């Protein structure tokens, strides 16, 4: 019941954490809009850094994956973003697409939660509106 | 085009290709690689735009070396024909530079773009 | 009583300025290891105010 290993993400403060399908890598969302991939396949108590996805100015409030290839993230600027996490791909970390949610006129819009739907290959997103 | 780095992404390029358009309208755009080199030497550039699809790509690869020397942010866009069209010409433009002017009417978004490029770098 | 309270804050104070210097007290290694680090507030207090916005009318 004690902290086995304390690891610093080495980025802005964390909003969200998610684990991949193979359970070997952790994706970590930050205040500074940086998404850090942490490798954990080494062993229990072994946390290692894999890669940093590009840096954007909106927070990352939520994270989920599609298998081990893509990272979907909801952002505080009212936009959903897909990053490419494939190993051996020139488009690694590459922000392939951006979606924009309908934004409250008088209010800031936040994408609080995003989840991936394998059967329909769809993304479901919940927003502040 | 592995060496073109950092390369602006599909969302980002609009904000880049947007700002260049008004800069051309307001005569704050120096266009063509050789003009960009002038602006760095005189240090009158907010930042510089390059096209990754250029062939042979190296022609602009001197500009970055001059860029970090002067601590000037820079970014690559995928298409050169797109850039020249945004510059406001009938010929593809590979490299373009925005002229420094704190009194400009388009002043705010240029630096907003500059910050994003800085984060990208 | 207020003097006693101010005494606590002096004990709580872990850094003081000496001339041009400010010296900082060093915490124990166990305090870090036993528990996770303290939450930063500006990151968290923001979420709480959002959940308790006026337009929501939590009332």
């Amino acid at each position: 019941g004690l902290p086995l290993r304390n690891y610093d993400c080495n980025s802005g403060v964390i909003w969200s954490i998610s684990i991949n399908d193979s359970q070997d890598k952790l994706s970590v969302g930050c205040d500074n809009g940086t998404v850090v991939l942490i490798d954990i396949s080494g062993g229990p108590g072994v946390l290692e850094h894999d890669t940093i996805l590009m840096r954007q100015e909106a927070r990352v409030l939520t994270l989920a994956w599609k298998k081990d290839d893509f990272v979907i993230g909801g952002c505080s600027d009212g936009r959903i973003r897909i990053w490419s996490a494939q190993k051996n791909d020139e488009n690694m970390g590459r922000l392939l697409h951006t979606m924009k949610v309908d934004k409250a006129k008088k209010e800031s819009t936040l994408v609080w939660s995003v989840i991936y739907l394998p059967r329909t290959d769809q993304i479901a997103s919940g927003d502040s509106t | 085009n592995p060496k073109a780095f950092p390369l602006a992404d599909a969302a980002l390029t609009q904000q880049i290709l947007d700002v260049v358009q008004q800069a051309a309208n307001l005569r704050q755009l120096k266009k063509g690689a050789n003009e960009a080199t002038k602006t760095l030497n005189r240090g009158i550039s907010e930042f510089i735009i390059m096209a990754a699809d250029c062939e042979p790509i190296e022609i602009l690869l001197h500009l970055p070396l001059l860029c970090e020397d002067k601590n000037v942010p820079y970014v690559f866009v995928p298409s050169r024909v797109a850039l020249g069209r945004a510059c406001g010409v009938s010929r593809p433009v590979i490299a373009a530079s925005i002229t420094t002017n704190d009194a400009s009417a388009i002043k705010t978004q240029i630096y907003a773009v500059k910050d994003k490029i800085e984060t990208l770098l | 009583k207020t003097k006693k309270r101010k005494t606590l804050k002096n004990l709580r104070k872990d850094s003081v300025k000496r001339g041009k210097f400010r010296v900082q007290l060093l915490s124990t290694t166990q305090d870090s290891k036993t528990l996770p680090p303290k939450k930063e507030s500006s990151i968290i207090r923001s979420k709480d105010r959002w959940l308790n916005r006026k337009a929501l009318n939590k009332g």
Partner: peptide, 16 residues
């Protein structure tokens, strides 16, 4: 640079 921090700081803060 000093201003840009404010612009970045202002942009990140939620607007109510």
């Amino acid at each position: 640079t000093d201003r840009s921090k404010r612009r970045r700081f202002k942009r990140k803060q939620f607007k109510e």
